[PDB]
Amino acid sequence: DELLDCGLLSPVRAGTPVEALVCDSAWLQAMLDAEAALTRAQARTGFLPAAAAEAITAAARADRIDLLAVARGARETANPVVGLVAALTAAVRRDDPAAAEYVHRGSTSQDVLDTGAMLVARRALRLIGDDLDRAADALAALAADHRDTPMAGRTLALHAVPTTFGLKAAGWLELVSEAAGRVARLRDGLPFSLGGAAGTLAGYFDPAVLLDRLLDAYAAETGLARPVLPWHVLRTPVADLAAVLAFTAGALGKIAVDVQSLARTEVAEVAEPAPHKRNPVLSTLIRSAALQVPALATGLTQCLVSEDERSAGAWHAEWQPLRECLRLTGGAARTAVELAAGLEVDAARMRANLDLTDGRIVSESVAVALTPLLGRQAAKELLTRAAFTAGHEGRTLGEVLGELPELDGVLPKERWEALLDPARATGVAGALVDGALAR
Amino acid sequence: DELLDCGLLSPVRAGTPVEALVCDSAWLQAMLDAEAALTRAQARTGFLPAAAAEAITAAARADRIDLLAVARGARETANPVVGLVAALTAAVRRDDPAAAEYVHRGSTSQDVLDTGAMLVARRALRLIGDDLDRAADALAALAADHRDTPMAGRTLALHAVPTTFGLKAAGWLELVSEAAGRVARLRDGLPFSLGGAAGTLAGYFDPAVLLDRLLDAYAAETGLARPVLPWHVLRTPVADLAAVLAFTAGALGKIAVDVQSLARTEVAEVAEPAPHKRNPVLSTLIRSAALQVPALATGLTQCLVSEDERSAGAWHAEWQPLRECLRLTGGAARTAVELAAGLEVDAARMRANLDLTDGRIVSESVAVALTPLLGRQAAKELLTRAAFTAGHEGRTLGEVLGELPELDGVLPKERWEALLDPARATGVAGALVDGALAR
Amino acid sequence: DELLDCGLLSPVRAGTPVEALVCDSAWLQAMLDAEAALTRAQARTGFLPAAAAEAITAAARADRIDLLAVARGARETANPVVGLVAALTAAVRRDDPAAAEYVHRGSTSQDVLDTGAMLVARRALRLIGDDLDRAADALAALAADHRDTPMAGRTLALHAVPTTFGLKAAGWLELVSEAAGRVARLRDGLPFSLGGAAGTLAGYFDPAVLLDRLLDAYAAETGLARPVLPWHVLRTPVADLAAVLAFTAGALGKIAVDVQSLARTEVAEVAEPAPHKRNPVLSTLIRSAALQVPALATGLTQCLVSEDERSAGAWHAEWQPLRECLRLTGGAARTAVELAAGLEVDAARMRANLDLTDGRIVSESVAVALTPLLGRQAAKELLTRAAFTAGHEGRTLGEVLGELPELDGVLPKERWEALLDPARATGVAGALVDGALAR
Amino acid sequence: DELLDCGLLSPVRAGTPVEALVCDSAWLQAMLDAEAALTRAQARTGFLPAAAAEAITAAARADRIDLLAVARGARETANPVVGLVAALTAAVRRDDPAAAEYVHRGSTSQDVLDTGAMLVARRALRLIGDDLDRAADALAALAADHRDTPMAGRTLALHAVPTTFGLKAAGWLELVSEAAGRVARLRDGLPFSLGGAAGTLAGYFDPAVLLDRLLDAYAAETGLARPVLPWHVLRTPVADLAAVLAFTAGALGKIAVDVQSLARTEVAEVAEPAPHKRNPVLSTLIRSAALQVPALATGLTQCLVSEDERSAGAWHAEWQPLRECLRLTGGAARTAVELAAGLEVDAARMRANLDLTDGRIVSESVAVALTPLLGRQAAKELLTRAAFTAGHEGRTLGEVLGELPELDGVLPKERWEALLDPARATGVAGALVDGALAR
Numbered sequence A, B, C, D: 001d002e003l004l005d006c007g008l009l010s011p012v013r014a015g016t017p018v019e020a021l022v023c024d025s026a027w028l029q030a031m032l033d034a035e036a037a038l039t040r041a042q043a044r045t046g047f048l049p050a051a052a053a054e055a056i057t058a059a060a061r062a063d064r065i066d067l068l069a070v071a072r073g074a075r076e077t078a079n080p081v082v083g084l085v086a087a088l089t090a091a092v093r094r095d096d097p098a099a100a101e102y103v104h105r106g107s108t109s110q111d112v113l114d115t116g117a118m119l120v121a122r123r124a125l126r127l128i129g130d131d132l133d134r135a136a137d138a139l140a141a142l143a144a145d146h147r148d149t150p151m152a153g154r155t156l157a158l159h160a161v162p163t164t165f166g167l168k169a170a171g172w173l174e175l176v177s178e179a180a181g182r183v184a185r186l187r188d189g190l191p192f193s194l195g196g197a198a199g200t201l202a203g204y205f206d207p208a209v210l211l212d213r214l215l216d217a218y219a220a221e222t223g224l225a226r227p228v229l230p231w232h233v234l235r236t237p238v239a240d241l242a243a244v245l246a247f248t249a250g251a252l253g254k255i256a257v258d259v260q261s262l263a264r265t266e267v268a269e270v271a272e273p274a275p276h277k278r279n280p281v282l283s284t285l286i287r288s289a290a291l292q293v294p295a296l297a298t299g300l301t302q303c304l305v306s307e308d309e310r311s312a313g314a315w316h317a318e319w320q321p322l323r324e325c326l327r328l329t330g331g332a333a334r335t336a337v338e339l340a341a342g343l344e345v346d347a348a349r350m351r352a353n354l355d356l357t358d359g360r361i362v363s364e365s366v367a368v369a370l371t372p373l374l375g376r377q378a379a380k381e382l383l384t385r386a387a388f389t390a391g392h393e394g395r396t397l398g399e400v401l402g403e404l405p406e407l408d409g410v411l412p413k414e415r416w417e418a419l420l421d422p423a424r425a426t427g428v429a430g431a432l433v434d435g436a437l438a439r
Ligand SMILES: O=C(O)/C=C/C(=O)O
Pocket: A079, A108, A109, A110, A197, A310, B277, B279, D155, D156, D160
């Protein structure tokens, strides 16, 4: 019972579909896929017989392998591939003793492990990107629906000038659209790893002709990209995954702290989909991943410093944090879809909250309107003293302005009601939402 | 088959005893322990009947609970305790319907989860500290045995002056002894968490009298420390665990990169215990943890920034990285015991490597010996030109010194053989090892 | 004009006294102090003449040295000490040509640089600890004054149960008191660095007798601690500074996000000391450091992985992040003193905000009071439905309870007013503040 | 004298040209550039008179501003722009009192600061990319020259199979070419910041018409990119800089640890350009930055979590780490150019080191050659026992193979000399270098 990893300590991903893509047996399967695709590619190239490739492929199934034994024998070589290869070789030998000779021919641990890593990453990135696309669809709908829903723009925790929830949602959309675009691009460029014992491919084998044939076949068999050079110590793919997962988690973290700001008791402008404590749990889960993935990504970025032809530790430090980043970001993406899809916007509570500073939140809109008649510098100086006196006498900004002798008869009454209305001073928030949505 | 976490991606801890202390079901058990100890402490205080405490305790067993259901229901509240409490309540109800009313009385999720966290940490720290003590015993034996084993001190990757492997091992010992001392001190000071819904303990209940009685009983029932204040947002214990685990992993990482420097093909002064490639896998595993725990610790330290009376995410970000730190550091400690216990020191290869700079490595010892007869500044200037000319004419430093007219007749021949012997110029490395070992 | 570092990009420390302790010329001075104290200690031990020590000491003044030349010549050896030593040697030579021979005798770059580092750290830690003590005095006064000032405890961004600002301030005090205690302890244990070229002290020189005399004198001349072993690659002091600075910054970050939560427009329970936008700038500055020091500390912790007898890079990576940590934490400490000293608590706005959930915030206090008459499980179930119906019909919790037939005549009216008063349901917050303040 | 930042603690960038691009006065200048370009763009759009734009531009010079006063007044608002604007306004007022009214019209602190940030970043990225291009030119020459220079491939610190220094240098080239490509792309896409007080641009002003005219003019006046939306809390540009600087530093760190591995005393296959201790200082400096920038980048990535319309701290945490990343990576780039340009390759010492395992390093090449005559599985099993017996009897691998009865007469003597020659078993390293160089 002590082997089960249920997501007990990580509810942001527990029960979400990324768990099955990136669990230990999924990695074991990915490593078997890499082995079988290698023998298939070597067969298509002519270095081994097709019947051997067919038999190895048929045996390359996690169900044929003892996961716990493979994982526990890894301490002998610091990686699981030697144990895996021996287990796969016996499974093929049971059925086809001639094929077993061809398991793992000319190959090395890192080719199989890193190729499996990139296969797990490609499959997890497909899920992450599909969820990000779902989030973006919901966010674009929020952004269009609420183009004209006024609310208090908040800077450094205080009301500043009014804005629109549509504009805020378009910013959420911008981040999510950006992350989904990078996830898809990174997914299409993840490479296989075919290098041999020290990156010369000596074991797999005019020379340019057979290299390009084997590289083109291994790309076909794996579906992964063909890289310029073996990358056993050129860890660009891992640093890229590090970067796009930390960006994705951070972007989703941005939505999460925004929802928490808007969802708190004193504000109550939004609510997450549902004693009588409806805690914002979805944003809490997204945030919990955002406070984890960047630190994990930094450890992954440092592994670019990989010495010689295979690092004695820095490569080994990559596997678990890479799996965690995929897992946490995948959970956060799924959670963000749920959050964006079910978010409840309370437009009336937003309008009401605009009145909380007693007109101070429009005092830059009023300064602009008075500038033709007072001058820029004098209008600002006049609104500053009013905003302080209103924030002393407990009166509204309109009340205090209506007692300044400098202002008598300066505007028709109907125009004063229009100027003091926070719901009208939204700048060009509307034109910004359209340009965002036209893209 | 997709729930098994076997350590496939983390061989530094796979198969080591810390895995069972800190796996998901161990945390579930720790949380049940915290619940049962709370009811026992409330019974000893008088707030509930002892038979209820006895029945709750007997039901508070991981085998009575569905781990996967608890973990997957946590998405509803962002933590597993509500689901756990409901599962424990049904288990007690099957046997004793009056006791079930008392499960989780007056309590809150964070009291149970954090108390379980500190119980897991205390038990894992006991194992980590015991292994560190075993490493230190082996290191002290290496340090004593090799007090006089000369070798090249290396600075910025080049031979500098000679030293002793005993001195180097005493530095390893110093780090390990330091980490083991902090692990034991932190272990004795980990506190329970008894705060109630927002840290006032309103649900658990002249006032100073019943507080101190309940606090003293909960400390007795858990064996954990009693803290001054509820620490739901005073995350000192977690930051402390963060700090001592990152220090421990880093210290062990220091031994690991040293072994790798000494174990490489061109050096071969040590070997790890055992085609014909005996890779230093133990140091590789220790190093892999050292490249992971500090990044994880930094995420844990940032959670000190926990807003209000319970953070909406920063507390949630603590559980998985804390479990990983305990797990990776525990594996690294176990691996370090194996490395220190079986390390093979090749004293003759150390002596031979001292000769690789053709005497240049003793040219500060020779400058010291010539200073009475040449002057400090002139002896240094004279050894500099010799060390360059020897590093040009391909001759030894002794050969080049034997042609300088300034040096003719300056020392008896027997004294020249003594000065040029790298094995004698070890400074006070011997007296340093003794002082280290006297402590 | 391009050499000035004014704190333009780091307002949290600009203009604060820690800037002068840890600027480049302060480090140059600290390194000169380390040199001069070494010659003084070697003179007290008998290895050089006292007049040479007196002359070197008198020349060991930053004003006698070209800072920019020293800093720019460091690229030749990757550290400034060789250039510094040459500059100090000429300054002493101008006055006393016999003393100049004794500058830097038997020594090495790292002894001087790390000793200077620990001197800068000791002096900066004295300032940091003194400010933390000032913050703690103000916080203890806030905690005592507001022992009985009721306010809404907030968990996961929502009102939970009532608490007291006194309790919250006592938690702030707890963190600050803890950090100030560690800063002072670390300050008293910072060691000097006296190791020689590779940690054997060969250049500085029965053997145990002269070692202990030189070590005891260097401790006297520097005022720093004597360590068991040279620590050129045993980076415990740097990791300790890393840990206590990140803890300190994080603890202060906790106060800062709390103030921001309480200071926002919709809450307005506190204000920082002072158009009409009084942004919480002090908490913003403290927070900006809290989001920087932990990442810097993690880089410093990783340098525990220092290979051989002197690392070719990991030691060099320590200086700038260590200086930044001291600088940012020092600014944050000074800023926190200002924040704690001038914080404005609005007790009436706290009381008023308690009413925002229309009684829901007391529904656990009411469940406790009804338990003798309804049962624990039934009282909770009854308050849950009321809290939902009140959060639907827009009525208070008292209103909805007054229509449940189960509750008719259950309590005198006077007792209902007492139960529904949020200002009375503060648990044992009062007894917690006293215990905190008794320590 | 206490304001000078000379690079005393950071020799990797001291004296390098990036220091002047990113020092405090360069940022002050960049912020003045942003102000002046805004008034110019508002003039080209028609919102203010051109003579005012000309006068503001002429006054917008760091020499007209007190840097220290601006930096020290920032504590009042937590950023320097209010103080800067007041200083610029007086400078323009001295000459042209009508223009002074137009300084900073409709604008906000973050527009100016972030636009200045992106200007500093664009100018520093131009330098970083130009140096990376210089490094890549030198690396491509090393890669071509040494296409056929055999050397020991090293995996997990031990000889594995032979490779070529040309192949290794092509991997260095791959990383540097990749980083230089991303630096140039990021440089072309850095955006200006024009958002107004809360991202609605209310102060700067059918609506889509004037927005696009002002945005198109501000892009022209700054030379920066036009973004879809104001990005005051959409911190994609900063996270991108974070990512590409950490990648760049890490890639250069890879070259640095490789040089250190090859440059150490026992190996001596390369030397950096130049008693008799030629420490690898350039690689030490590059490495010191690689151990700093990733941690700094992680703090910068976390600031994607920026709440509301302007964060109360997370934006403020960006400036100093962003400047440090540009500064350290710029120094590392310059240092890497020097390292790649002057690197000394010792081809003969590489060939000699191939013999250190007494033929074991070719035992996979020999297994391949014997496979037609023994079988794959039996050839491997036969070379394993030989490699162990050779690593016991102290004999070469050829010697031990020449006594196995299974091998008698299996190959002509001339073919045995060819098989046992480490310089011939380089796999397809040659064809890999060409493909790398064709790109
Ligand atoms: O570390 C590995 O996976 C393989 C190393 C080797 O073959 O030498």
